[PDB]
Design an enzyme around this catalytic site. Structure first.
Site, PDB file in Angstrom:
ATOM      1  N   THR A  16      -6.621   9.856 -19.126  1.00 13.79           N
ATOM      2  CA  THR A  16      -5.329  10.250 -18.577  1.00 13.79           C
ATOM      3  C   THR A  16      -5.415  11.476 -17.678  1.00 13.79           C
ATOM      4  OG1 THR A  16      -4.905  11.381 -20.678  1.00 13.79           O
ATOM      5  CG2 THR A  16      -3.910   9.206 -20.371  1.00 13.79           C
ATOM      6  N   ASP A  39     -20.749 -10.914  -1.651  1.00 22.88           N
ATOM      7  CA  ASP A  39     -21.222  -9.731  -0.943  1.00 22.88           C
ATOM      8  C   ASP A  39     -22.569 -10.008  -0.283  1.00 22.88           C
ATOM      9  OD1 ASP A  39     -21.925  -6.746  -0.558  1.00 22.88           O
ATOM     10  OD2 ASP A  39     -19.957  -6.622  -1.512  1.00 22.88           O
ATOM     11  N   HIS A  69     -25.598  -3.029  -0.576  1.00 25.21           N
ATOM     12  CA  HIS A  69     -24.158  -2.950  -0.814  1.00 25.21           C
ATOM     13  C   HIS A  69     -23.733  -3.825  -1.992  1.00 25.21           C
ATOM     14  CE1 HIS A  69     -19.875  -3.910   0.176  1.00 25.21           C
ATOM     15  NE2 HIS A  69     -19.838  -2.669   0.626  1.00 25.21           N
ATOM     16  N   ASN A 161     -11.221   0.467   4.927  1.00 24.68           N
ATOM     17  CA  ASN A 161     -11.642   1.855   5.106  1.00 24.68           C
ATOM     18  C   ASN A 161     -11.198   2.437   6.443  1.00 24.68           C
ATOM     19  OD1 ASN A 161     -13.025   1.569   2.632  1.00 24.68           O
ATOM     20  ND2 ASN A 161     -14.918   0.986   3.683  1.00 24.68           N
ATOM     21  N   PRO A 175      -0.920 -11.489  -0.510  1.00 24.64           N
ATOM     22  CA  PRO A 175      -0.095 -10.927  -1.595  1.00 24.64           C
ATOM     23  C   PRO A 175      -0.553 -11.307  -2.988  1.00 24.64           C
ATOM     24  CG  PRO A 175       1.310 -11.758   0.154  1.00 24.64           C
ATOM     25  CD  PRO A 175      -0.100 -12.145   0.525  1.00 24.64           C
ATOM     26  N   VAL A 177      -3.486 -11.747  -4.439  1.00 24.45           N
ATOM     27  CA  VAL A 177      -4.691 -11.171  -5.016  1.00 24.45           C
ATOM     28  C   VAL A 177      -4.470  -9.681  -5.255  1.00 24.45           C
ATOM     29  CG1 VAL A 177      -6.123 -12.957  -3.967  1.00 24.45           C
ATOM     30  CG2 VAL A 177      -5.827 -10.752  -2.811  1.00 24.45           C
ATOM     31  N   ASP A 200      -2.094  -2.968  -4.570  1.00 29.12           N
ATOM     32  CA  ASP A 200      -1.641  -3.116  -5.943  1.00 29.12           C
ATOM     33  C   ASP A 200      -2.079  -1.982  -6.850  1.00 29.12           C
ATOM     34  OD1 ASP A 200      -0.442  -5.880  -5.797  1.00 29.12           O
ATOM     35  OD2 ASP A 200      -2.459  -6.272  -5.046  1.00 29.12           O
ATOM     36  N   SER A 224     -14.862  -0.501  -0.976  1.00 25.91           N
ATOM     37  CA  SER A 224     -15.850  -1.391  -1.575  1.00 25.91           C
ATOM     38  C   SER A 224     -16.297  -0.919  -2.949  1.00 25.91           C
ATOM     39  CB  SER A 224     -17.090  -1.481  -0.689  1.00 25.91           C
ATOM     40  OG  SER A 224     -16.853  -2.268   0.460  1.00 25.91           O
ATOM     41  N   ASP A 260      -0.060  10.110 -10.281  1.00 32.20           N
ATOM     42  CA  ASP A 260      -1.042  11.175 -10.437  1.00 32.20           C
ATOM     43  C   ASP A 260      -1.907  11.409  -9.203  1.00 32.20           C
ATOM     44  OD1 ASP A 260      -1.454  10.170 -13.875  1.00 32.20           O
ATOM     45  OD2 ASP A 260      -0.212  11.781 -13.069  1.00 32.20           O
TER      46      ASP A 260
END
Length: 279
Positions: A16, A39, A69, A161, A175, A177, A200, A224, A260
Site C-alpha cells: 500500500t 514478443d 526484450h 511510450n 477497449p 483488453v 485501465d 513494456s 496514489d
C-alpha cells in the site's frame, strides 16, 4: 511468502506504500496458470525460468530471442527472482524480429495463434497473454486483441511510450483488453508513459530489473515493463480463484491502489496494480 531484496516493482505491487523492498505473495504463485509472452521470444534456457518457459511459435528463422526484450518481459511475468507469478508456465510467441520490429499481419497471426494454441496446453487456472508491443491505430490489430480476449485469455497490452493519448495506438486502444501504463518507484507516472481514457491500470515501468539474454539480467524502462507486472498479477489472482480471464482486468482495477500516483492527466485512471495479499 516473502521475497527479500526484491525488485522495487514486485515490492510495489504487494504494498500500500512506495519505498519498500520485500515482495509478499501467496505461495501458490500462479501454479496451474499459463502466460503467453508475445514478443521477440524467450531465452527459455535461462536458469531464472527453471524449465517453466518454452517457445511455442515463431514467424522468423529462429524462435530464439536475439534481442532480450521478450526475455525481460517474460522474466517480470514469471522468473524465480524477477517475476510476479513465480510458478506460472510461460509460452513464447515470437512475432517481433531481433531488432524488436514486426509487421501487424504477423502480430495479428500471433494473437489468433494464442487463442487456439491454449487448447493444446494445460492451464486449469486460466490463460493470460502479455503484449509489450504496439504501433499506430489499426482496427484490425484491435480486433485481433479483442478476439484473443473473447476466446478466454486475459489480454494485457502496453499503453505505449509516446507521452501521448493511447487512443491513437494499437492494441493499446482496444477497449476490451487491459491497457497498462507505467509508473516509477516514487509513484509518479513514468515520463514516457502514454495516458488517456483507454488505460485501465498502471504498473511499475521505470528502472525494472529482469532477465536478459545470455543468461544475464538488466534494468530497463517502458510500458513494456509495466505490462508483464499486470499479466503476472492476473495469472496469480486466477490461480487463487479470485477472478477469471474475462473479469481480471476489472478485478485488478477494483482492487488497485487508488489516487496514489502523481502526474496523472485529468481523465486518466489513477490506479496502481496491487495484489491485496495479506500475509
Amino acid at each position: 511468502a516473502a521475497q527479500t531484496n526484491a525488485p522495487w516493482g514486485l515490492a510495489r505491487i504487494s504494498s500500500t506504500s512506495p519505498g519498500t523492498s520485500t515482495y509478499y505473495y501467496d505461495e501458490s504463485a500462479g501454479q496451474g496458470s499459463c502466460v503467453y509472452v508475445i514478443d521477440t521470444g524467450i531465452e527459455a534456457s535461462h536458469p531464472e525460468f527453471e524449465g517453466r518457459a518454452q517457445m511455442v511459435k515463431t514467424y522468423y528463422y529462429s524462435s530464439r530471442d536475439g534481442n532480450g526484450h521478450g526475455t525481460h518481459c517474460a522474466g517480470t511475468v514469471g522468473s524465480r527472482t524477477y517475476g510476479v507469478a513465480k510458478k506460472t508456465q510461460l509460452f513464447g510467441v515470437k512475432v517481433l524480429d531481433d531488432n524488436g520490429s514486426g509487421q501487424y499481419s504477423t502480430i495479428i497471426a500471433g494473437m489468433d495463434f494464442v487463442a487456439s494454441d491454449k487448447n493444446n496446453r494445460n492451464c486449469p487456472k486460466g490463460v493470460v497473454a502479455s503484449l509489450s508491443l504496439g504501433g499506430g491505430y489499426s482496427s484490425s490489430v484491435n480486433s485481433a486483441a479483442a478476439r484473443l480476449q473473447s476466446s478466454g485469455v486475459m489480454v494485457a497490452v502496453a499503453a505505449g511510450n509516446n507521452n501521448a493519448d493511447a487512443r491513437n495506438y494499437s492494441p493499446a486502444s482496444e477497449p476490451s483488453v487491459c491497457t497498462v501504463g507505467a509508473s516509477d518507484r516514487y509513484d509518479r507516472r513514468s515520463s514516457f508513459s502514454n495516458y488517456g481514457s483507454v488505460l485501465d491500470i498502471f504498473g511499475p515501468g521505470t528502472d525494472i530489473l529482469s532477465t536478459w539474454i545470455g543468461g544475464s539480467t538488466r534494468s530497463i524502462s517502458g510500458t513494456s515493463m509495466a505490462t508483464p507486472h499486470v499479466a503476472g498479477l492476473a495469472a496469480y489472482l486466477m490461480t487463487l480463484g479470485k477472478t477469471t480471464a474475462a473479469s481480471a482486468c476489472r478485478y485488478i482495477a477494483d482492487t488497485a491502489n487508488k489516487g496514489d500516483l502523481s502526474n496523472i492527466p485529468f481523465g486518466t485512471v489513477n490506479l496502481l496494480a496491487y495484489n491485496n495479499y495479506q500475509a
